[PDB]
Amino acid sequence: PQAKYRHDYRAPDYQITDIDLTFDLDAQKTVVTAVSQAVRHGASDAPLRLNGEDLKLVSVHINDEPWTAWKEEEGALVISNLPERFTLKIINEISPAANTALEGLYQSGDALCTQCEAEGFRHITYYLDRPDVLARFTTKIIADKIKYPFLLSNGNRVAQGELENGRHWVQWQDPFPKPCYLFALVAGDFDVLRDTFTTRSGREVALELYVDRGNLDRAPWAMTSLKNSMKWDEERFGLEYDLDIYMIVAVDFFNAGAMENKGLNIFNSKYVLARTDTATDKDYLDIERVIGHEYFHNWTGNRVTCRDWFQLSLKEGLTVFRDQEFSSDLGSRAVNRINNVRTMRGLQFAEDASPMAHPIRPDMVIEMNNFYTLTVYEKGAEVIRMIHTLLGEENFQKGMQLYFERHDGSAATCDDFVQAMEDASNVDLSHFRRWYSQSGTPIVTVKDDYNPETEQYTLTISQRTPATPDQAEKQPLHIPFAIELYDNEGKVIPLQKGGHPVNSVLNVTQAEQTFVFDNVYFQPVPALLCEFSAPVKLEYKWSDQQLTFLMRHARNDFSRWDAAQSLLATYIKLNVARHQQGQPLSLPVHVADAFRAVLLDEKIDPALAAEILTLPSVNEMAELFDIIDPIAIAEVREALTRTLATELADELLAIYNANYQSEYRVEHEDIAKRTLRNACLRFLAFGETHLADVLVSKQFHEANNMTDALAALSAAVAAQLPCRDALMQEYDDKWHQNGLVMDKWFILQATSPAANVLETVRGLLQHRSFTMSNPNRIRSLIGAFAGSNPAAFHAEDGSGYLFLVEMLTDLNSRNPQVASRLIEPLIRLKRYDAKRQEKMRAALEQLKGLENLSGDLYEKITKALA
Ligand SMILES: N[C@@H](Cc1ccccc1)C(=O)O
Ligand code: NA
Ligand code: NA
Ligand code: NA
Ligand SMILES: [Zn+2]
């Protein structure tokens, strides 16, 4: 497969302004008729190259003339000798039932639906499948009335008819020009939840949410979230919906989360369906996040789109920032900030050290679905947030306004967005642009000094970015470095230099530089990199006492959580080293004291408390080490939980009972008490065994919602409690017919700490509720084993790797996108020890040798083996 380079971008030789599609739908054989008004911009000897994959061409007309001057290669229909303006007509055939990859037009249970981002429209007909070609679509759908009574596409429904032999048709029109990746089609039978939303200027929008028949009782939340998204985008950003109808379809067979198709979002049903006994707080909040996200894409992705795919982060970083803000405005901003920073440090940093490392704007891509990443999405968002941080809300909104004023109705670049922010605000982001071109995690080292003679605090901050596999050259970045100084009473010391205030977000633009603060009337305890003001690793030599001080006194809750993380990090590293020598856990008492103090703080917000009493994931802990010992890490996380459970047993139990809640609400106070309560239950499960077994079994059986029942079920598995097999069996007997709810069960099995976990996982390939035809099922059992049970995936004997290789040999043919997601734990081999590394490389070498090796895996395997 061939690599594409950002620096080869060229405006297309031809444009299409309008396309009229006809679909004669059938799952075995669908006929597509595509009539496209085109224009030649390039030179006359330059042919029209149309992208096309797995299509059966039936005819080619140019202004109704059967055309003889074309050929087919090799993903492409090449048409020669065209005029400056003409009507292209293609008829081709495709086969949805055969589409196991879920790219293009495929079959989701009984329905037919599309997924066209990034390059899936080319699996439907011959087209200029590239997001700098925008056109006005109209879409006619003919089908069997009984099997497909609903026929949907983008925009407004403008015509409809019956035919002989049980067939009907509908025609849709989307008046807004768009790249073909935003095209969508759905056909099938559904229950429909219908409501409306009236925009701040008075436009009444019909809202329609299509779900499998039976599931209307799981739709109101998603509908409520859509309304909330629409309202928030008006309030926060000044943006209103631009169409008369908003459709959302929930489908069970989908590779990602959801797709922002204009006026017709298609959603993985895991981010639509919720009922209090099937779904958790997290589900509810995710449903809110994704509905918001796809909604916010209507401006930051649709009304302004991407000139080319190398610009993905232009809409994803920005649109993620948007879902974060929305979630944060509506809920707890601190809790949101915290989890998003867990994700950055826990997962994204790993990618930015991996062989798949790339800038948020990639320079080279072989298969574009491999670039829907933590880096492009999450770090992308941190980069938007740094722009927010440097500009302030007011100027940020002016940049948004200028972005849209300049680029509405067109396809922009990352640079265009940055130019608009710069131009609207008058802040220079010239150097800041480097965040877009440079990969890897900057490391920021901080060294300080107090001078009591002069009452001055001196900070000497330096930065380096280690070379990455993709880039041998690295330079300093424009790093917004937010600080606060505390005196001995916990009061904030005003920042100043000779007479005048100083903004507390420092501009760290150099390899090394020094900042001097006057009037520091007492040796300060500093809070560094507040609110995670840049996506960097922080090096500063904290004492434990500085950190416990911050946990009591820091003004932002993030800082208090984060200080607790730095307190733990030191002892996680200590105890991994101890595990490696067969010694048991050592933990000074003042650490356990700090956590007792949080459990008993009457005034601390229970949401913050619960995050503090949530130990870093194994994936987070992993980022503390050059070489990862996944077994030591897993065993230490367990030991640390056991120790705290033991020290704090009484406090844990007290806080657990005090936070009991009779009623179940999805409301930020209630979620917070419940999250704290379950954090407590978790430690308790690792305490005294008879009490653990009684508490957990009781909670599972008494629970009136899935959040409480699953926290228990999950503790039973984690702590290997006596009641575990019964509870697991019960859950299965109750929920086996519901795939989404079983995912939770499969994840628990896949992540069990049991000795025979792999063996069970293998057996679960035969489970009634499992199937390899469903990505959600694949992800919850196989993916969760390989990505989320690193102790078992990395067994010394290599069984984890073989298991994955056998699974990937299947999926590479069936569904390369899901395969590529699953391969990721294997391309991290360079982070593990030599013997592990050899086995993993052997596994990658096996997979490289498959016939019909997919481009998706090829890209990762060749990078991982370099
Ligand atoms: N554009 C979708 C994600 C997506 C990409 C590619 C395929 C499927 C889904 C989003 O960001 O929400
Ligand atoms: Na689609
Ligand atoms: Na166009
Ligand atoms: Na809030
Ligand atoms: Zn997105």
Swiss-Prot record:
Entry-linked Pfam families: DUF3458, DUF3458_C, Peptidase_M1, Peptidase_M1_N
GO CC terms: plasma membrane
GO biological process: proteolysis
Top-rank taxon: Bacteria
Entry annotation: catalytic residues: E294
Topology of this chain in the membrane: Peripheral membrane protein
Keyword presence, Chloroplast: no
Cofactor note: Binds 1 zinc ion per subunit.
EC code: 3.4.11.2
A single GO molecular function term of this UniProt record: aminopeptidase activity
InterPro entries for the chain: Aminopeptidase_N-like_N, Aminopeptidase_N-like_N_sf, PepN_Ig-like_sf, Peptidase_M1, Peptidase_M1_dom, Peptidase_M1_pepN, Peptidase_M1_pepN_C, Peptidase_M1_pepN_C_sf
Reaction catalyzed: Release of an N-terminal amino acid, Xaa-|-Yaa- from a peptide, amide or arylamide. Xaa is preferably Ala, but may be most amino acids including Pro (slow action). When a terminal hydrophobic residue is followed by a prolyl residue, the two may be released as an intact Xaa-Pro dipeptide
Effects seen without this gene: A quadruple peptidase disruption (pepA, pepB, pepD and pepN) does not grow in M9 minimal medium, does grow better when supplemented with casamino acids.
Keywords, in A-Z order: Aminopeptidase, Cell inner membrane, Cell membrane, Hydrolase, Membrane, Metal-binding, Metalloprotease, Protease, Zinc
Entry's localization field: Cell inner membrane
Co-factor requirement: Zn(2+)
Site (Transition state stabilizer): Y377
Binding site for Zn(2+): H293, H297, E316
Main location per the UniProt record: membrane
Binding site for substrate: E117, G257, A258, M259, E260, N261
NCBIfam families: pepN_proteo (TIGR02414)
Purpose of the protein: Aminopeptidase N is involved in the degradation of intracellular peptides generated by protein breakdown during normal growth as well as in response to nutrient starvation.
Family under the similarity heading: Belongs to the peptidase M1 family.
Protein name per UniProt: Aminopeptidase N
Provenance organism: Escherichia coli (strain K12)
Top-level taxonomy: Bacteria, Pseudomonadati, Pseudomonadota, Gammaproteobacteria, Enterobacterales
